[PDB]
Amino acid sequence: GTSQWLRKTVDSAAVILFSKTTCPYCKKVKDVLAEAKIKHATIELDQLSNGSAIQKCLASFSKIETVPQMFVRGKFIGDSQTVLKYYSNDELAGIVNESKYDYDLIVIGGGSGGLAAGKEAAKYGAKTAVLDYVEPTPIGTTWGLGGTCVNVGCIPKKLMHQAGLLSHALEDAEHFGWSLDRSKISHNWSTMVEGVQSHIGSLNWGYKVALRDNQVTYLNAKGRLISPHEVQITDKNQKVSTITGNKIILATGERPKYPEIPGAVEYGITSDDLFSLPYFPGKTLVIGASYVALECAGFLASLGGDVTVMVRSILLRGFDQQMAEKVGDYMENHGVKFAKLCVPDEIQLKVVDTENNKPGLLLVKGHYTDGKKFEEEFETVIFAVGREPQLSKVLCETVGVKLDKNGRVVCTDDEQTTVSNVYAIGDINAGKPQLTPVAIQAGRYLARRLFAGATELTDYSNVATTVFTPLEYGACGLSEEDAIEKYGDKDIEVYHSNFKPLEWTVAHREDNVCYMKLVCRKSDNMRVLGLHVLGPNAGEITQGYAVAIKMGATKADFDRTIGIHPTCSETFTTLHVTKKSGVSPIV
Amino acid sequence: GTSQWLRKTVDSAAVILFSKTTCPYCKKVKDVLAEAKIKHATIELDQLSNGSAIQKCLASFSKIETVPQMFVRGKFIGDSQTVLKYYSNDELAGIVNESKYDYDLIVIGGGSGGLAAGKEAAKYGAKTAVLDYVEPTPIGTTWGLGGTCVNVGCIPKKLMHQAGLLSHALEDAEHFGWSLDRSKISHNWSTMVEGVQSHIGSLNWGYKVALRDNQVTYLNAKGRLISPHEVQITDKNQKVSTITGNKIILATGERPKYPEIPGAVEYGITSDDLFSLPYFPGKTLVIGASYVALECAGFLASLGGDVTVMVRSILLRGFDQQMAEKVGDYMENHGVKFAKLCVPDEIQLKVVDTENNKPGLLLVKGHYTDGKKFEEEFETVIFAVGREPQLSKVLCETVGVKLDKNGRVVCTDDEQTTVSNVYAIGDINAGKPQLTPVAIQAGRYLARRLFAGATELTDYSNVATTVFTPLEYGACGLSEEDAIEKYGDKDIEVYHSNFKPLEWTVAHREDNVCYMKLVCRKSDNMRVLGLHVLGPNAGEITQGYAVAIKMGATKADFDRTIGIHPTCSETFTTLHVTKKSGVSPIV
Numbered sequence A, B: 001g002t003s004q005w006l007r008k009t010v011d012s013a014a015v016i017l018f019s020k021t022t023c024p025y026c027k028k029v030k031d032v033l034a035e036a037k038i039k040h041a042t043i044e045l046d047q048l049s050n051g052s053a054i055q056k057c058l059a060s061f062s063k064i065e066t067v068p069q070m071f072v073r074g075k076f077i078g079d080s081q082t083v084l085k086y087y088s089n090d091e092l093a094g095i096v097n098e099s100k101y102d103y104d105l106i107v108i109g110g111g112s113g114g115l116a117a118g119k120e121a122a123k124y125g126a127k128t129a130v131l132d133y134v135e136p137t138p139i140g141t142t143w144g145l146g147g148t149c150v151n152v153g154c155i156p157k158k159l160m161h162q163a164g165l166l167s168h169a170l171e172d173a174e175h176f177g178w179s180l181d182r183s184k185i186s187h188n189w190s191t192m193v194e195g196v197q198s199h200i201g202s203l204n205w206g207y208k209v210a211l212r213d214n215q216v217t218y219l220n221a222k223g224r225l226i227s228p229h230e231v232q233i234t235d236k237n238q239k240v241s242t243i244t245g246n247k248i249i250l251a252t253g254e255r256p257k258y259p260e261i262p263g264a265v266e267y268g269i270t271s272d273d274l275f276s277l278p279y280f281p282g283k284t285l286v287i288g289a290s291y292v293a294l295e296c297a298g299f300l301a302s303l304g305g306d307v308t309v310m311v312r313s314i315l316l317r318g319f320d321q322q323m324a325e326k327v328g329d330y331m332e333n334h335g336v337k338f339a340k341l342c343v344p345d346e347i348q349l350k351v352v353d354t355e356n357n358k359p360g361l362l363l364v365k366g367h368y369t370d371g372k373k374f375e376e377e378f379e380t381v382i383f384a385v386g387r388e389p390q391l392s393k394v395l396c397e398t399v400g401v402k403l404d405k406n407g408r409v410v411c412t413d414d415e416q417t418t419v420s421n422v423y424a425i426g427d428i429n430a431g432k433p434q435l436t437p438v439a440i441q442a443g444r445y446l447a448r449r450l451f452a453g454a455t456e457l458t459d460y461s462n463v464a465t466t467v468f469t470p471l472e473y474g475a476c477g478l479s480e481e482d483a484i485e486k487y488g489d490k491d492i493e494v495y496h497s498n499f500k501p502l503e504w505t506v507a508h509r510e511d512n513v514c515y516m517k518l519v520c521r522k523s524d525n526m527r528v529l530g531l532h533v534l535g536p537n538a539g540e541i542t543q544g545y546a547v548a549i550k551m552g553a554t555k556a557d558f559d560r561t562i563g564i565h566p567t568c569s570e571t572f573t574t575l576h577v578t579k580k581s582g583v584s585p586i587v
């Protein structure tokens, strides 16, 4: 038990000191390592109820039972007198750098998860390398260090969402007394892109500085695992070489899919291209119905564009479908057109003019599920029909890492693959929510278990989400249909209400469009199984409730907590209308 | 136990039916009452684990042990056969209206608490009257039904706060690509007031409609309790009369104080006057340092005004003083001037011109705590030096209701005064947080205990707050200094961080001004004693965390919950820098 943990810790830590906070001999070893700038993990035995037991187990490796004890990569180095001897004789630098491998850790993929894992491991003295490379899109788009979220995801998406939101603030201002005239103001796409891209540039540079300051080696190279400990790297000159590492973390993410039709790759774009596009897209077709599709369509319309969304079946598959329909209804009332139950069959009438900053023109042909035909011209066509990994480029199948039927890595609950020294984190971890804060938490927690003897696992359940459509949708836990499927309609109670933000009153916005509900399990003290809210700032509203749901909140916990007035969020503290009662939810 | 509860319930309920959901004789009595439009409370004995015991106790009043049993104001009316007999013989209307008093409930005060209490009591068949009157301010300002929050408080304050916030949205828009020029846009005060006042007007009317639709009598009259059951009312013609009631709820609120100096009442105004002022105040002095003072100063500056705040000692006395100082520092960097350690001694140079919509001009003289002199001219002087009840106008001291040294009503934990049939709720309840949602919860819960046999008490602990200064400040639980005083510095750990909203990046706003912290008790599993956040949308951020603190969240509960990205609120899920460590909190 304790003995099993200690063996695992000693074997995988790079440099680790067993100590006590009250021991001057430990302090003198700490000072020597600090001064030689040797980084290491420290385990303070007097701060663990298990400490006396661990102290005895140490003797199985060192034959001594006292503190301090220093280990390097599984080898007992010495006690106080012995470490200071190596220091005085200038033997200590060569002792702590001695390794069977080039690196204690190689991270393949320099995005949300991989950067977090790499920086946290180097905190504890692991010799670490982070590999990152960006395969260009079909039209040649590329970007800097940091992954999908930073460069072509959460960060630019929310900044352009904010640009769309400011449209409505400009309209609202006249009602609150400001002298501007909204009808005489227009938007400049290229000015917005320049500002967004300048912020992303500071993030790329910030990550390079952070790695250098943690003594992490950054290689801008394409990595391929060719045996359990060997990574083949190809650089920007196509020079090829091999590096070795003790532990391997796979963190290579995903990229957008294209449908298998004529013209798609040649004449359409994806979200990868949109966030740095030099010209306004113009009349735009978005094919797909995921949150990427709806978020992108939504801000394009708020920035004055003519936007159509082509929906194969339903909006936001996998989310609560009542809330998905209210989301789409809001977008349709505020400009966005929808081609429902429709798929494309083929896509060129005019070539893009990059010198004069003008889109081309495309003819899109498709059909509806009843057989009727679709045909219409667009300047830009954006595909948002999902994302997939490409692990055949990352992973020789003879290494023995097991993949599932979607090509994602099958992992134990501590992120281990079927090869004992190889782990996987982030979007390529089969079955996990595909989100940036999940990837960061997995990576940081994993590095602590490998190199600092930590035990805490990542908790993947009830992770909250927000869809940043023009009216935002936040959620935590089960959709209503999923709760009813799992427990039965008789055992589910739903409390709900419409609401109107106070900010919408003087501005003359709509009365009964914002909405919220709690899905509860009757037979478990009315436990809150799922929380759902459509309204402004939905992400800020939802976040704090995710802690309470993590601890098992019930309806009674929401009732006894007092609201903050005036806010949108306070409506959750006084809900009382149930769906079973048939009483209207309007304000 | 059960017997004691049942006696209390039967004695104070107006009309109550003891029933079972599976009994057709109960359903036929329900239908008869429903059809005669007799409102009543219902207690379903098969839905309480205590039901069999209650069924036997019923026989102490009726000599029968079966359901249904109908009671009116403490008197057993009959079983099924007997109730339908009264109905068939047209004796039932006169049986349920029979009362020793005019009303089952008289509520004195028609604001946040009083309106909530009155409407909830009439739900259960209590014959109810709500009295409301608005004493005019020194210059003659008055307003309609609904209390301080609706008319001269939370509602207009936040709407003018929103008007100030839109200033910064107008500036931000150019950076996000919109073609407006902020420097050429001005604000029109009277246009804003017209819109704010139109919304308040719809609230006044909405409350009158709601009372009529619940069969509550609304009397626009000044009430005075002259004996335990007698209320003297004076109407708008000074006609005087007396009405009687079984239960009395006092809910009369507070009004602004004036300092005892020459010129204050004659030439200054308070928040009561500001929210409907026909002209822009111009160059304005705000005397005081409470949240009212800072909120009002803050939006006046955002609307283009020249604003000074005169502070006797500290800002936001009673709130966390580190956060109070960051609040004030932000206001000072964005325009607001401060006269620190200063008090006024006397206040006319020009009379207000109401025909041409122009303020007057005043000379203010004062002194600093070291003895130096203050002297300066202002167009408007606003006093925000606290609020107080005036219960000598509400309450003959011979009734025997006990007051504390501040003139607030001393209450038991179920809101009872020292007179057994008289209760107090809202701002006049001594020792309670003075907030609109506390008053609403107290009133609704109290009406259910009086007239529906409920037992749940209002929980007054750890009630969250938000100060709507230009940069908002939300909090829940203990300030840091209060936690250190109660538990000792050694037992307190503080995790904190600066942050920057993603929306501030492209807009080039400040890097290290937003701030958050968790104050935790080491010896109680790092329990979160207090949460503090300075930033945009602080009220929406804080609300949901109040549920988790109500259930006793620890630091580990915050760590294991995953963030929503990108939001301000997610920074609470990854805090790690402690104050004890001395590590900088900057981004």
Ligand SMILES: Cc1cc2nc3c(=O)[nH]c(=O)nc-3n(C[C@H](O)[C@H](O)[C@H](O)COP(=O)(O)OP(=O)(O)OC[C@H]3O[C@@H](n4cnc5c(N)ncnc54)[C@H](O)[C@@H]3O)c2cc1C
Residues within 6 Å of the ligand: A108, A109, A110, A111, A112, A113, A114, A131, A132, A133, A134, A135, A146, A147, A148, A149, A150, A152, A153, A154, A155, A157, A221, A222, A223, A224, A251, A252, A253, A254, A271, A292, A393, A394, A425, A426, A427, A428, A434, A435, A436, A437, A439, B564, B565, B566
């Ligand atoms: C449009 C869009 C919007 C999104 N919005 C949000 C949002 O609001 N909130 C949220 O939580 N999530 C959002 N996401 C999801 C989020 O981007 C991902 O969940 C997250 O980036 C996953 O991180 P990761 O570490 O798994 O991979 P990534 O961040 O994708 O990083 C992987 C990196 O590895 C590189 N790489 C690949 N193969 C190799 C190789 N062989 N050698 C070297 N390097 C390689 C890739 O080029 C990339 O740089 C969004 C995603 C998209 C597409």
Ligand SMILES: Cc1cc2nc3c(=O)[nH]c(=O)nc-3n(C[C@H](O)[C@H](O)[C@H](O)COP(=O)(O)OP(=O)(O)OC[C@H]3O[C@@H](n4cnc5c(N)ncnc54)[C@H](O)[C@@H]3O)c2cc1C
Residues within 6 Å of the ligand: A564, A565, A566, B108, B109, B110, B111, B112, B113, B114, B131, B132, B133, B134, B135, B146, B147, B148, B149, B150, B152, B153, B154, B155, B157, B221, B222, B223, B224, B251, B252, B253, B254, B271, B292, B393, B394, B425, B426, B427, B428, B434, B435, B436, B437, B439
């Ligand atoms: C400027 C300002 C801003 C505020 N902002 C907020 C905020 O953002 N959030 C928040 O939670 N709280 C806020 N508050 C506090 C909130 O207004 C009060 O806590 C709340 O109104 C208390 O309600 P109440 O029922 O106790 O009394 P009130 O709402 O004051 O109602 C009492 C009513 O009784 C009437 N009355 C008095 N005497 C008699 C009599 N003898 N006969 C008949 N009627 C009588 C009064 O005229 C009044 O109409 C603010 C207060 C102020 C002053």
Ligand SMILES: COCCNC1CCN(C(C)=O)CC1
Residues within 6 Å of the ligand: A133, A134, A220, A221, A222, A234, A235, A236, A237, A238
């Ligand atoms: C067969 O190997 C091709 C490798 N592709 C990439 C292209 C250039 N890369 C970078 C670092 O941009 C790294 C290698």
Ligand SMILES: COCCNC1CCN(C(C)=O)CC1
Residues within 6 Å of the ligand: A353, A356, A358
């Ligand atoms: C005065 O010059 C105006 C610029 N001419 C542009 C050239 C490019 N055009 C395209 C590509 O359709 C549009 C007209």
Ligand SMILES: COCCNC1CCN(C(C)=O)CC1
Residues within 6 Å of the ligand: B133, B134, B220, B221, B222, B234, B235, B236, B237, B238
């Ligand atoms: C001595 O009694 C004076 C009563 N003052 C008020 C003035 C007029 N009121 C209203 C309802 O506006 C009610 C009575």
Ligand SMILES: COCCNC1CCN(C(C)=O)CC1
Residues within 6 Å of the ligand: B353, B356, B358
């Ligand atoms: C053309 O008329 C302009 C209005 N004249 C106003 C009259 C009132 N004045 C005061 C009260 O100072 C200011 C000048």
